[PDB]
Amino acid sequence: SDTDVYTDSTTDDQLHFTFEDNTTASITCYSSNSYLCFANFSHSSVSRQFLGILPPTVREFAFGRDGSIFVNGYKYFSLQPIKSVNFSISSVENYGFWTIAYTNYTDVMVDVNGTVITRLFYCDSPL
Amino acid sequence: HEDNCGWYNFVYNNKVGPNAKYSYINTQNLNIPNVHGVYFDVREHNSDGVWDQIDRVGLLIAIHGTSHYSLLMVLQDGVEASQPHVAVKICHWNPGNISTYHQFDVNLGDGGQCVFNQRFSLDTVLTANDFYGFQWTDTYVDIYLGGTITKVWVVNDWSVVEASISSHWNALNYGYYIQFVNRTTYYAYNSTGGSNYTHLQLTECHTDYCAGYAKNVFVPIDGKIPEGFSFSNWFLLTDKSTLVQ
Amino acid sequence: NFQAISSSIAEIYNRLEKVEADAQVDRLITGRLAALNAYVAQTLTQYAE
Amino acid sequence: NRIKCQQLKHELPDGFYSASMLVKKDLPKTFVTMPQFYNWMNVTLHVVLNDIEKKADIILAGAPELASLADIHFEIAQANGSVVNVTSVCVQARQLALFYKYTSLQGLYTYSNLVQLQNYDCPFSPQQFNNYLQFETLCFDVSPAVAGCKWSLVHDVKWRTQFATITVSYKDGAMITTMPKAQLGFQDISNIVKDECTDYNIYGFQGTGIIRSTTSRLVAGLYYTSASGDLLGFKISTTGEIFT
Amino acid sequence: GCKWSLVHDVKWRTQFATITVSYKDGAMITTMPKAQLGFQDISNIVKDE
Amino acid sequence: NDIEKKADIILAGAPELASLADIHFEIAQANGSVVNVTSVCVQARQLAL
Numbered sequence: 001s002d003t004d005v006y007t008d009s010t011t012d013d014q015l016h017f018t019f020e021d022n023t024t025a026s027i028t029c030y031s032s033n034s035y036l037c038f039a040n041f042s043h044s045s046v047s048r049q050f051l052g053i054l055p056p057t058v059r060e061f062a063f064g065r066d067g068s069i070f071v072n073g074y075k076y077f078s079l080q081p082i083k084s085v086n087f088s089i090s091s092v093e094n095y096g097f098w099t100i101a102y103t104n105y106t107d108v109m110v111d112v113n114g115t116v117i118t119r120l121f122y123c124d125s126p127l
Numbered sequence: 128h129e130d131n132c133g134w135y136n137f138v139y140n141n142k143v144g145p146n147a148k149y150s151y152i153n154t155q156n157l158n159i160p161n162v163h164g165v166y167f168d169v170r171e172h173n174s175d176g177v178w179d180q181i182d183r184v185g186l187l188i189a190i191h192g193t194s195h196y197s198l199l200m201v202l203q204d205g206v207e208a209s210q211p212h213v214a215v216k217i218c219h220w221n222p223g224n225i226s227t228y229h230q231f232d233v234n235l236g237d238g239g240q241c242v243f244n245q246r247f248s249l250d251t252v253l254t255a256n257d258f259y260g261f262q263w264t265d266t267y268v269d270i271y272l273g274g275t276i277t278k279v280w281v282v283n284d285w286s287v288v289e290a291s292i293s294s295h296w297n298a299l300n301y302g303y304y305i306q307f308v309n310r311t312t313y314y315a316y317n318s319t320g321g322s323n324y325t326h327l328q329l330t331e332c333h334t335d336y337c338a339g340y341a342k343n344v345f346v347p348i349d350g351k352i353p354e355g356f357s358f359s360n361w362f363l364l365t366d367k368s369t370l371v372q
Numbered sequence: 373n374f375q376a377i378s379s380s381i382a383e384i385y386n387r388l389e390k391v392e393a394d395a396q397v398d399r400l401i402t403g404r405l406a407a408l409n410a411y412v413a414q415t416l417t418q419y420a421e
Numbered sequence: 422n423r424i425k426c427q428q429l430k431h432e433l434p435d436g437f438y439s440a441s442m443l444v445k446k447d448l449p450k451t452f453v454t455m456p457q458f459y460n461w462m463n464v465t466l467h468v469v470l471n472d473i474e475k476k477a478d479i480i481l482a483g484a485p486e487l488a489s490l491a492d493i494h495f496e497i498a499q500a501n502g503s504v505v506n507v508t509s510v511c512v513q514a515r516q517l518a519l520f521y522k523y524t525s526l527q528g529l530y531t532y533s534n535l536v537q538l539q540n541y542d543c544p545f546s547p548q549q550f551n552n553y554l555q556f557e558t559l560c561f562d563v564s565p566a567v568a569g570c571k572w573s574l575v576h577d578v579k580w581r582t583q584f585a586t587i588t589v590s591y592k593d594g595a596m597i598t599t600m601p602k603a604q605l606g607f608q609d610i611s612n613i614v615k616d617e618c619t620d621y622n623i624y625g626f627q628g629t630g631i632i633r634s635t636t637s638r639l640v641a642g643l644y645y646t647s648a649s650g651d652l653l654g655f656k657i658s659t660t661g662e663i664f665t
Numbered sequence: 666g667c668k669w670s671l672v673h674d675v676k677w678r679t680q681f682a683t684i685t686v687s688y689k690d691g692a693m694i695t696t697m698p699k700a701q702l703g704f705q706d707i708s709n710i711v712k713d714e
Numbered sequence: 715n716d717i718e719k720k721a722d723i724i725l726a727g728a729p730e731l732a733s734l735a736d737i738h739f740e741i742a743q744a745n746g747s748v749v750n751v752t753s754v755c756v757q758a759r760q761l762a763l
């Protein structure tokens with residue numbers, strides 16, 4: 001929910017994908033706070049396709065390989081098999097760091113209380 | 128300069144800070160002051176510094192690399208008025224230089240390549256000295272005006288800051304500090320329960336990656352998130368419906 | 373959905389007409405009525421025990 | 422008396438009897454989906470029957486004989502002025518509606534020669550199709566093409582002999598949503614109706630109930646189900662408020 | 666019999682024409698993936714694992 | 715067929731690809747090359763698709 005100015009005048013991306021076999025998608029966003037976000041499936045911004053509205057308090061992006069784009073948990077829209085991600089975004093804290101994980105699927109238990117994860121537990125040992 | 132850093136403790140770090148939390152703040156900021164009345168402060172470095180002034184005299188800062196051809200520059204005036212206001216512009220000019228001594232509402236160039244403009248209200252709420260500077264990295268321009276931090280994404284090929292005071296006073300004194308930062312300093316915020324200096328316990332660090340210990344960074348010891356960890360930012364990923372309990 | 377379209381009844385009446393939606397919702401009724409008798413007989417086990 | 426009719430007894434023993442009320446008949450509708458820029462189509466099915474060679478003995482006509490007198494086409498409406506006819510449109514847009522309009526050539530709109538649609542295999546009848554149904558893909562056809570499920574097309578509404586099917590091809594999804602009455606202009610779909618018993622259609626979930634507004638914020642997905650697949654709450658996307 | 670579909674856009678699966686197959690269950694016809702030729706015996710009993 | 719409809723085949727409608735379609739079963743003869751048919755129906759013992 002970093003809401004700043006985007007004075008590109010270069011038709012910038014703010015999020016750029018590379019699909020399998022050299023195909024480019026480039027999505028951008030704005031604000032109103034709702035999130036107007038459009039797309040391009042081209043080399044330049046030849047048109048615009050309306051994705052949706054992201055809710056005002058975004059605090060997790062998630063890019064699956066097949067094309068899933070999770071936001072806050074929910075799957076908002078699918079896409080193509082992703083090869084690489086070219087990104088430029090920030091956060092409203094100016095304090096510490098983010099985390100960008102590289103992650104595999106694994107069966108676990110979760111503790112949910114008020115729709116947020118309380119305590120995680122793994123399933124790897126036979127016990 | 129303990130009190131002056133102690134004033135820097137109060138006003139500058141009251142930008143954002145929530146309660147009961149500590150982090151590892153790294154912003155290229157002050158270490159040792161400078162007072163300058165040369166009125167053409169042509170200095171070339173690698174990031175901005177911060178100025179400081181209480182009296183009612185207009186200011187002007189210009190930020191550029193070399194004189195480019197489409198790479199936009201920064202223009203800014205801090206002028207005293209009924210309310211002391213400040214306008215920042217992002218545009219471009221070939222002609223001119225700041226040996227000026229005029230009045231400066233909007234006075235440097237009508238560049239035909241201009242995209243960003245905003246007239247900010249400087250919050251002169253405190254009677255003590257309050258700091259106002261800027262920062263850029265490579266694509267990423269910072270504003271520290273008044274009560275917030277605002278970000279501009281353009282491009283930064285920037286190494287020449289131009290600062291000047293445009294008035295010929297005969298003989299006046301100015302309580303007036305301005306620095307120019309070309310460094311990579313680090314700090315360590317605290318605010319555990321309140322050390323009552325004002326609310327916190329600062330710590331500058333010497334070299335690298337100090338006792339700040341941001342809880343977001345962990346060590347994936349087995350491929351496994353460590354137990355006893357705030358999941359304020361990790362979610363259950365699904366597509367059908369979320370849980371509640 | 374006991375061999376029917378969907379597991380909610382108001383979904384069924386907003387796709388089909390009443391002359392043919394009744395056959396689909398009939399499998400919901402007889403399926404769910406058996407689900408009560410599975411519960412009731414388990415309960416009367418415990419009341420007598 | 423409703424307790425007595427549920428008890429099959431003219432006299433009840435005194436005690437506790439679970440009773441409720443028949444709810445209502447007319448309820449104001451309510452339809453909430455993810456906001457999208459409107460792109461609404463208007464395709465109509467149009468059947469014209471030749472009645473100029475076979476004046477008043479069309480009720481004696483055999484089944485393939487009406488196929489020569491048939492005229493089946495999809496009048497897809499252009500947004501410029503008039504309409505265009507095709508054989509098998511298959512939709513790429515976001516909102517659409519199927520309308521039906523049969524015309525005899527010489528005022529023959531009596532019971533003994535009609536045409537009306539008939540659900541034969543599809544899990545949705547054609548006269549319910551303009552409700553808020555949700556698909557991923559949807560493509561129509563009039564020929565014996567690629568088989569999805571097929572709709573019938575009957576002549577005598579007493580003696581329902583068939584001409585030719587309208588097969589549809591589809592799979593479930595959320596990109597295509599049917600609309601009955603062309604919500605144009607708005608880049609937001611609406612009619613949250615609060616504090617009364619409504620009929621909702623929320624993100625594909627469906628049913629009747631009372632919707633309120635609350636002051637509690639959950640950082641999660643769109644909606645919140647029970648253990649039985651019923652709606653308990655949902656989040657508007659354009660703002661942050663959630664409903665119950 | 667039953668029919669297989671044949672789709673164009675693997676995002677937007679519009680169909681051309683089906684490949685219907687006709688069949689009934691039995692043991693005279695067995696599909697093989699990789700053409701076991703030459704042998705008059707089919708094999709690969711794999712023991713103790 | 716991609717020779718009349720260079721790079722706008724993604725805008726082609728559903729029956730339009732049916733004219734550009736070419737569906738056949740290349741049944742392999744055991745002598746050398748392959749033969750194309752429209753609808754083979756197998757009499758042999760092992761086969762693969």
Ligand SMILES: *[C@@H]1O[C@H](CO)[C@@H](O[C@@H]2O[C@H](CO)[C@@H](O[C@@H]3O[C@H](CO[C@H]4O[C@H](CO)[C@@H](O)[C@H](O)[C@@H]4O)[C@@H](O)[C@H](O)[C@@H]3O)[C@H](O)[C@H]2NC(C)=O)[C@H](O)[C@H]1NC(C)=O
Nearest residue numbers: 064065066081082102103104105106107124347349350351
């Ligand atoms: C997390 O999950 C990922 C799955 O999405 C895991 O990625 C898999 O990683 C394994 C090991 O690197 C890959 O398997 C290897 O693939 C190479 C190349 O494959 C080709 O050749 C093999 C036969 O040699 C053939 O079976 C394949 O079909 C290809 O023809 C092989 O040389 C290796 O022998 C081995 O098969 C998986 O392919 C890969 N997933 C995919 C489909 O890319 C990742 O390892 C996981 N990380 C964890 C659990 O730590």
Ligand SMILES: *[C@@H]1O[C@H](CO)[C@@H](O[C@@H]2O[C@H](CO)[C@@H](O[C@@H]3O[C@H](CO[C@H]4O[C@H](CO)[C@@H](O)[C@H](O)[C@@H]4O)[C@@H](O)[C@H](O)[C@@H]3O)[C@H](O)[C@H]2NC(C)=O)[C@H](O)[C@H]1NC(C)=O
Nearest residue numbers: 462463464465496497498502503504518520522601602603
């Ligand atoms: C979906 O598309 C349908 C096909 O066009 C739409 O039906 C059209 O609705 C408009 C509403 O304005 C009609 O225009 C009116 O026509 C009547 C007289 O109708 C008769 O004469 C016209 C002469 O042009 C003829 O075209 C008709 O077929 C009738 O013979 C006028 O009295 C009104 O003032 C007005 O002009 C169209 O006539 C009508 N077309 C057809 C073929 O029915 C339908 O509204 C669309 N639905 C939507 C957008 O939800």
Ligand SMILES: *[C@@H]1O[C@H](CO)[C@@H](O[C@@H]2O[C@H](CO)[C@@H](O[C@@H]3O[C@H](CO)[C@@H](O)[C@H](O)[C@@H]3O)[C@H](O)[C@H]2NC(C)=O)[C@H](O)[C@H]1NC(C)=O
Nearest residue numbers: 158159169170171172173174286287307308309310311312
């Ligand atoms: C950006 O900042 C860095 C360091 O903060 C600049 O380094 C400057 O480096 C020179 C050495 O090349 C330092 O000068 C030294 O000065 C002493 C005193 O006369 C002299 O005895 C040594 O032999 C040497 O000359 C200089 O102090 C240091 N300056 C600063 C700003 O700390 C770097 O030059 C800066 N970027 C610029 C302006 O190019």
Ligand SMILES: *[C@@H]1O[C@H](CO)[C@@H](O[C@@H]2O[C@H](CO)[C@@H](O)[C@H](O)[C@H]2NC(C)=O)[C@H](O)[C@H]1NC(C)=O
Nearest residue numbers: 111112113114115116117118119371372638639
């Ligand atoms: C985790 O769940 C428990 C159980 O619902 C929550 O405990 C409730 O907390 C509120 C405020 O602290 C009290 O008013 C309730 O009475 C508590 N419930 C019970 C049964 O005593 C707890 O708040 C949840 N944790 C969260 C939301 O962070």
Ligand SMILES: *[C@@H]1O[C@H](CO)[C@@H](O[C@@H]2O[C@H](CO)[C@@H](O)[C@H](O)[C@H]2NC(C)=O)[C@H](O)[C@H]1NC(C)=O
Nearest residue numbers: 166167168169170171194222223224225226289
């Ligand atoms: C504008 O004028 C100032 C002041 O004359 C120039 O600043 C000088 O820059 C040179 C080269 O970097 C230094 O050696 C001098 O010490 C600076 N100050 C003075 C007083 O000369 C500045 O370069 C000029 N900018 C132009 C002409 O574009």
Ligand SMILES: *[C@@H]1O[C@H](CO)[C@@H](O[C@@H]2O[C@H](CO)[C@@H](O)[C@H](O)[C@H]2NC(C)=O)[C@H](O)[C@H]1NC(C)=O
Nearest residue numbers: 149150316317318319320321322328338339340
């Ligand atoms: C900030 O200062 C506080 C004390 O004013 C530190 O709190 C102590 O932290 C250590 C571990 O680092 C604990 O063992 C002590 O019990 C804490 N004291 C209290 C008051 O409980 C705090 O750690 C400092 N900041 C950080 C994160 O190092």
Ligand SMILES: *[C@@H]1O[C@H](CO)[C@@H](O)[C@H](O)[C@H]1NC(C)=O
Nearest residue numbers: 018019020021022023024083
């Ligand atoms: C580019 O795409 C082609 C096919 O689209 C692929 O074979 C190749 O690996 C891609 N990457 C390159 C050339 O780096």
Ligand SMILES: *[C@@H]1O[C@H](CO)[C@@H](O)[C@H](O)[C@H]1NC(C)=O
Nearest residue numbers: 013016017024026085086087
């Ligand atoms: C992707 O990132 C690389 C490295 O930052 C950059 O050179 C390239 O231009 C980017 N691609 C885009 C913006 O399409």
Ligand SMILES: *[C@@H]1O[C@H](CO)[C@@H](O)[C@H](O)[C@H]1NC(C)=O
Nearest residue numbers: 320321322323324325326327
């Ligand atoms: C710290 O001391 C100051 C006195 O200047 C007091 O106002 C403040 O409330 C104290 N904070 C705590 C947490 O006790």
Ligand SMILES: *[C@@H]1O[C@H](CO)[C@@H](O)[C@H](O)[C@H]1NC(C)=O
Nearest residue numbers: 498499500501502503504505
């Ligand atoms: C709409 O445009 C089509 C051509 O694309 C034209 O044939 C038709 O007459 C137009 N209709 C009106 C009334 O504008």
Ligand SMILES: *[C@@H]1O[C@H](CO)[C@@H](O)[C@H](O)[C@H]1NC(C)=O
Nearest residue numbers: 493494495505506507508509
């Ligand atoms: C549309 O109607 C015209 C006029 O009768 C007819 O000639 C044409 O064949 C029709 N087109 C289709 C695709 O049915």
Ligand SMILES: *[C@@H]1O[C@H](CO)[C@@H](O)[C@H](O)[C@H]1NC(C)=O
Nearest residue numbers: 742743744745746747748749
């Ligand atoms: C196989 O035999 C057929 C005739 O039965 C002949 O047409 C074909 O060319 C032969 N192929 C080879 C390569 O022997």
Ligand SMILES: *[C@@H]1O[C@H](CO)[C@@H](O)[C@H](O)[C@H]1NC(C)=O
Nearest residue numbers: 737738739749750751752753
């Ligand atoms: C086999 O291919 C030839 C060459 O294109 C063609 O002429 C012939 O019609 C095909 N036969 C069948 C049965 O498809």
